[PDB]
Amino acid sequence: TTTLAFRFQGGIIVAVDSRATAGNWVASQTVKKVIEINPFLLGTMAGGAADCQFWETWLGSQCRLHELREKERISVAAASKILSNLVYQYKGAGLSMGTMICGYTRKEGPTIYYVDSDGTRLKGDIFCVGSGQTFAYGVLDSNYKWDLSVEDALYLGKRSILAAAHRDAYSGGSVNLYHVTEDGWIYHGNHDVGELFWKVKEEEGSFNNVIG
Amino acid sequence: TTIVGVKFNNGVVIAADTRSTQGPIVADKNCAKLHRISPKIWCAGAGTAADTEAVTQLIGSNIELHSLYTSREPRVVSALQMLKQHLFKYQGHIGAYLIVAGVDPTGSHLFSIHAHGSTDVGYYLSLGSGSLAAMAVLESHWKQDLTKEEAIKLASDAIQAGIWNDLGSGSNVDVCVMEIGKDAEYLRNYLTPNVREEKQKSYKFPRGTTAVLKESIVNICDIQEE
Amino acid sequence: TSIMAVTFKDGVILGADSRTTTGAYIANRVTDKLTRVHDKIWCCRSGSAADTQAIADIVQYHLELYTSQYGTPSTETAASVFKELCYENKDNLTAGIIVAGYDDKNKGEVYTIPLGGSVHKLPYAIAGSGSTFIYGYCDKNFRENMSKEETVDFIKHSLSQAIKWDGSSGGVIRMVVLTAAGVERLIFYPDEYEQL
Amino acid sequence: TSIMAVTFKDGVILGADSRTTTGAYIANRVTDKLTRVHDKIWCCRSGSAADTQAIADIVQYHLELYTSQYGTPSTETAASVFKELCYENKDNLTAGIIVAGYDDKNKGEVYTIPLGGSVHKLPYAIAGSGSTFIYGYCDKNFRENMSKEETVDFIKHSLSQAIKWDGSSGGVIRMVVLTAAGVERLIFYPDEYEQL
Amino acid sequence: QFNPYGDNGGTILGIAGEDFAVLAGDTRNITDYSINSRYEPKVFDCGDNIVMSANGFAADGDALVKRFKNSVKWYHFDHNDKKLSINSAARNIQHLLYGKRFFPYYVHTIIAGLDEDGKGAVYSFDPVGSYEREQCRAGGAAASLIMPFLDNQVNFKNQYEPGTNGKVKKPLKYLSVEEVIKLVRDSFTSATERHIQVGDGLEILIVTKDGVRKEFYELKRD
Amino acid sequence: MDIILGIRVQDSVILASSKAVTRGISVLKDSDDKTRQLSPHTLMSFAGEAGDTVQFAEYIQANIQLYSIREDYELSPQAVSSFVRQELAKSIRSRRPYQVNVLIGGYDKKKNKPELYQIDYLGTKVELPYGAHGYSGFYTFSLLDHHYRPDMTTEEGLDLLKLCVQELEKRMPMDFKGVIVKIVDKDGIRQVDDF
Amino acid sequence: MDIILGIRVQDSVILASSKAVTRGISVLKDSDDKTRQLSPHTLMSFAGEAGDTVQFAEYIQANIQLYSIREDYELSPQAVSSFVRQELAKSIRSRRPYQVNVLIGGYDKKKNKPELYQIDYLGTKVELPYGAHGYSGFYTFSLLDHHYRPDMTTEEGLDLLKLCVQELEKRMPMDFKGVIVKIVDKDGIRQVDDF
Amino acid sequence: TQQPIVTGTSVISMKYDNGVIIAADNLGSYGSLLRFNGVERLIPVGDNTVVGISGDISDMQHIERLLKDLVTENAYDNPLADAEEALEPSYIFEYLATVMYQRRSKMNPLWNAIIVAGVQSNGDQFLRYVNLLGVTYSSPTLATGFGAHMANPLLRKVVDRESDIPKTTVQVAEEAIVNAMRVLYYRDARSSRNFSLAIIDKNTGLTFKKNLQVENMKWDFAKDIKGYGTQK
Amino acid sequence: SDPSSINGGIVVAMTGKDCVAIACDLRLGSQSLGVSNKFEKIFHYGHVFLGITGLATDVTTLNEMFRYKTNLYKLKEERAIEPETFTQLVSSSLYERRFGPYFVGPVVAGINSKSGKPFIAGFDLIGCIDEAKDFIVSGTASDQLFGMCESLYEPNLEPEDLFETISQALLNAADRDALSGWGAVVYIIKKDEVVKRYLKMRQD
Ligand SMILES: *[C@@H]1CC(=O)NCC[C@H](O)C[C@H](NC(=O)[C@@H](NC(=O)CCCCc2ccccc2)[C@@H](C)O)C(=O)N[C@H]1C
Ligand SMILES: *[C@@H]1CC(=O)NCC[C@H](O)C[C@H](NC(=O)[C@@H](NC(=O)CCCCc2ccccc2)[C@@H](C)O)C(=O)N[C@H]1C
Ligand SMILES: [Mg+2]
Ligand SMILES: [Mg+2]
Ligand SMILES: [Mg+2]
Ligand SMILES: [Mg+2]
């Protein structure tokens, strides 16, 4: 599992891999690790897949009830805290979650909260979670700037997942991209890692270690 | 594994299924579980498959040398004593459970032997994961003064019980008949009741389906002249 | 397992059931637990079959070599050889052995060697899992200098009860009679002893 | 502990040793293990003394309250109350109880309640650590419709052997006789029963 | 100590076609090295053109199927006999499974049917209720034997067009119901050969707009 | 969390708290503020188990803010620390205790005195001139024992704190990514933005 | 010990190795050279269990130096790495195994090629363009995968190595006190004294 | 969570053309001690069902009382209690299967394996298994414990699949069951010679046979067996 | 912790008409971390081919050991070792370490030079010979390979068809295993020519 999200000039990029495992066995290569909480909020999946799916879907219901009652879009701060307060009630029971609640509101601007099943809630600019997080961080940290274009940011997120997919045995399958704007998230496709690797190798001149 | 031994009129018969397994996976569908210790002393092995092969070959080697030294045809009790003293030495860590049968100048014999070194005498024996299924059949149909044809039938029926009802056992039935004053006859795949049906589809691929990066000739020959 | 040896006027008789179990499965229902270490020195085996067979084979070897050099060994000598193996290898053995034999000088003798490797000379001895159920019965019914027929009945009735109550015991009751007259093997089937 | 109850022609007799041990120390050598839950319904206790006393006290209460409302309870009713406590609290109890009683309609009855909380109606019953040694003896020597004197002898001889072999059993042999005639207590000292 | 779980073996397979879906499963029920039954149905018609199988621990599997069937019944009562769509059934099963998150149903669950556009649908669940729509899914004992074969023969993975040498992929042409059943049968024949817990019989439930049909095939009984 | 220090000088309390947040393998953040303002003249720094730390701190904050509104009055640092200690002492015998250690730095406006309280997760309270939690004290106390004076200025307190942080950066194995420093005095709470 | 990196460029092998030695609570040293010269054109860096690392390295050094004297000839990097691997593969089934991971950087004077060998404590040998041991690879390989070229100069190799070290300093929790860098080429072994 | 104390061994059963046969020995074991020699482990419910139980005897006796109460309860306000609204085998089984699974789910199981054998209203044979885990399955032959390993192989030679059921007479089926009981007596250390057998036939109803014995036993060959290898 | 699945990797062998094929992936890892994409697991001693999966230090050690033994064999016998004889040598050698085994899954493949008969064999870690007619599988994706081989294989395939079958068996099995992949090699072996092909596959 490799998932990342970073704030930039044009909003937020969210990028995830697609692999799920049960030990050495590759259970699925088609896993949807970005949960569409609603049209304006995104959540990432790391740790146990059921816990992330279930609770971030539930979060979408709580966000919907908030805006029905308050006649106003829920803040990313408030949404993330609903989830972190919930998992904190279950602390010790054995929930396994690492997630980033991503959104773009008027009052906050683009915002990312890392929420985690032992109760942690952190606001930040760049987050990477999963077995392949360190690989993705390497690419992100050396190439990140606030003034990236939407096109270049999308590629950086895609390239950072590819880096992890290559080295980390438990990451791969395909890359799912999202771009979060104030008017909502925009899906930027599913990209098979098998095809993407060779495409990137040739065009970029990287991965000279690998024969192609 | 299902292995049986059955005494009859003028000898002894031994039988086994042909399935070897690694956990719930089948390693070999036509495994050979009947080991020759000497020309007229054979045995069937259950438990760890390497151990049953190794322990029979070692004893079979030493039995052969003993036979040459003494100028006498080997005895089942010699194989028995040598096997038990060896297995006992390793305190069950060599996981061989054997049914040892044969004919020699003394007569026909049938023994079992367990990994810890204990031995048992009998007219009918069974061993392995399918031993209870086999023993049910042997207890229902065995009698004194079986003929050769009846003993082969009873033995292979006992193996079949193991094949069908025990998940550890399967595929084919191997038999070895050791009759007094005769060559032992090893009947490999005596029964074959588990042939796979024809598949619905051929999966032969069109040539050039697989993507290739490089080709090269491998030099298997030695360094050449001139 | 239910095993016993009983001295009587003319010598000694060993008795045993025939059941060998691997848990609740009966691996052998016709086991011979009465084993010969010399012409008129036999033993009853209980505990690990591997261990008791290994011991009995070594003892038989030692007494064969004793006989070649020094003539017929005493029953006490046989029991001492058993003890030496059981005691010195107590950490690695699970063997409870009853040694019974006939001399002409000493007549019938019984020695029991429990788990520790201690030796106890007794008028009669009982051992194995099924023996627990017949301590009461055997103590009340044993007499010294019984006849052959009385001793066979004493053993037959005793082991019958042991078999009845102990799941680990069963099958046929085997016996071996040791007297000046020689060595006699007896067998008694379920239909005989169950109705007692 | 060695405890038993035996039905006979005129009713039923309960029997017990008197030894209570904490490991190898005898905490009480004159214990009364025969306990009254109703006028002619008694029980023998084995296992945890705390548990069996607690149970017996509760049963006595239930049968007292039963008697005030519905008249004299049956021995079966008493055994059922014991069972209800033993079965429903099997995880927290170590109690092996023999229930014995005399009705005029049903005469002498014996119910044994082993560790699980199951009930078994029997002609006679034996229990406690010392019982293992007398299964053989009791099975061979029990007859139905014995006299009072024969049943006292049967119990006396049986528990004598149980005491002889079991270190956890000993002291005096107590007995309680239940007939139409009433309730008779008997006691037998070591010098009497050891020489049997 | 008491172990509340067990393993009854078995293997199941769901494949979604263009206007149909199949859910197949072997009929063998086992514990350890023993056969309990050679014919114990494992794939069930749950009503509303949905088929279901919960493979693994058979007690939990039966309980879950029973509760879902019941959920279909109460959906009709509470919402004016409305047809439960496959996506709605899938979400409902997530809540059934996750309801027991801290004492899971030890089963790998698959349902099959048609979506609201009439196209074939298969949904796959883990024991704690994470779920996902898929084209192809094997579950249970021999799932590791079957899935690689389905990647190759259904989705044409690692297959390319001759003469191009790795440049052009084999195109993803749709499979008929007859073609899918062939791959199902060969998957189970192959699994039966190499997995001791697979055998005896194969029961396939096919879902089309016309309803639910059954097909049964013998498998090797060793 | 890792390093939290506190020093009470003449006229103020200075709290220093590390910026690193590490989740096992990676450093997820290097700018984390491990502190909450309980009232205008009372600050609480905290360190302990992930999640519990912030949950506890905000829970305390909410309760003190509630008291302030109800009474239109700021509780003394002593009163706040006693409230906090009781909450932790209650917590230690709970089903799942708060695994949180705190420093409470406050300026008492009645007595015109700075006050520093050190409270561990068991509810062990001590008033100190300087304090720490975890391994921080092992490295720093020998320096504070030597250099500390009760009549120090705020600038001298900050210099002594720099020497403590330098010793930590030299001899601690973990990279704690520097410290955020905050001062509590008669005028309230302010952050030293360059350290 | 902690971080050891290696990168083979056009005409040289560069080994970078951390300077920190930590015994539990304190950093005992911040200038430790985790390397031994085996021969004039072969260098071995190492990391693993305390004591074993140096004992193993010096034992290898002594044996290669003995070979050099006996034959008046320098063994190839390949030959040295094979010798080292066998010693570790022998070690893993010993009473007490050497818990040591090594990188062997050498310049083969016969083939005029730099060579980098990565060998773990089990005796698992691989020839690589770049390598690491422990958690170092987790942070650095994604950068090396991106930027590495086989025709890089020694100066480009050093710049790529700086980027690797910077990423380690950002995201690793442990302060490894920087790295000593050494270059192995046709002229032998030299240390980069400013890094 | 408990451990079984007093236990009952194999229950074996099979279908035949007109009904079902079920059998179980009369022993209550206390570990290796063969403690209770008169325990009935086949419990009839009405005239169309027999429930055979193995495992813990105290839990069996509890199940026995539940079934007794089920009959009483079914009769309440039920004019057709002895006719159309009588208890069916399928009703009795499902009830037990519900209880077994509920009890394992509270981590406090009834430590048993149960076979419900009977004939339905429409003449269909009913035979189904349930155990302490709530696992249920049906088959032409069913057996618990040792019977699963030894009886089933013998009984499956008579009825191997569904199509063999109409071809199997009650005489052939009973013969197979009685032989299986003998094999179990030879080979199961926790079995007894005395057993009970019940036949539920759609024509002749419920026949319950008590105090049966294993007979025609082969022991004579034991006399020739000497030593464990080299002895004479 | 489990030595046989630290490094990862797979080997498969198949027979055809007058030919054999043996193939392996190229991954070496440290559990999740990919370390090398050039770790070949197939070796040869004359015309006999040996694939080895499992713990990589033992893969290397055993290759060096069988090179040693086959070299001395050749000097003494004055001929190259045959696949049937080599199989026995592997079995012997593994079993001599019965109580401290090499954590490996060897696979022998080759054609007997005198009879021309195709031969394959597999072993467990202590030397039990599995001599199949059809195919042998080994490694962390052995289950996956069994599934592929069991459906894809048919007897008497011509060399260039056998190449496709074994390649697709390896590739699709490896893609369903986290610890296998990163490249692959297929040897096609005939009586007096051997072709070696590197396959293009996904690099995750
Ligand atoms: C990212 C990778 C990752 O972080 N993996 C860490 C381990 C995660 O737990 C793996 C997770 N996979 C799943 O959630 C997986 N489902 C299961 O593992 C279900 C396990 C049920 C176990 C059980 C215990 C007791 C009783 C019964 C069952 C997918 C298939 O659902 C994962 O892949 N995480 C990815 C996103
Ligand atoms: C008869 C069936 C039978 O008795 N099965 C019971 C289990 C047997 O062990 C299965 C056996 N299978 C094999 O032997 C299998 N290999 C192994 O079991 C290797 C075990 C290695 C153990 C070990 C040794 C040293 C160090 C660490 C571990 C073969 C088939 O590959 C089996 O098939 N038995 C058959 C004959
Ligand atoms: Mg990968
Ligand atoms: Mg018995
Ligand atoms: Mg099978
Ligand atoms: Mg892969």
Numbering used by the authors:
A (entry chain Y): 1 to 212
B (entry chain H): 1 to 226
C (entry chain N), D (entry chain b): 1 to 196
E (entry chain Z): 1 to 222
F (entry chain X), G (entry chain J): 1 to 195
H (entry chain a): 1 to 232
I (entry chain I): 1 to 204
Would you copy out the relevant sentences from the publication that reported this structure?
Interestingly, compound 4 with cinnamalacetic acid as the aliphatic tail instead of typical medium‐ or long‐chain fatty acids for most GLNPs was not observed in heterologous E. coli, but it is the main derivative produced by P. laumondii pCEP_gli mutant. Thus, the main compounds 3–5, which possess the complete 12‐membered ring structures but contain different aliphatic tails, were investigated for their inhibitory potential against the ChTL activity of yeast CP. These prearrangements facilitate the Michael‐type 1,4‐reaction of the Thr‐1Oγ to the double bond of the GLNPs, located at C4 in the 12‐membered ring system. In contrast, GLNPs have the highest binding affinity to the ChTL active site at β5.
The eukaryotic 20S proteasome core particle (CP), a barrel‐shaped multicatalytic protease, represents the catalytic core of the UPS. The CP is composed of two identical outer α‐rings and two identical inner β‐rings with total 28 subunits that are arranged in α1‐7β1‐7β1‐7α1‐7 form.
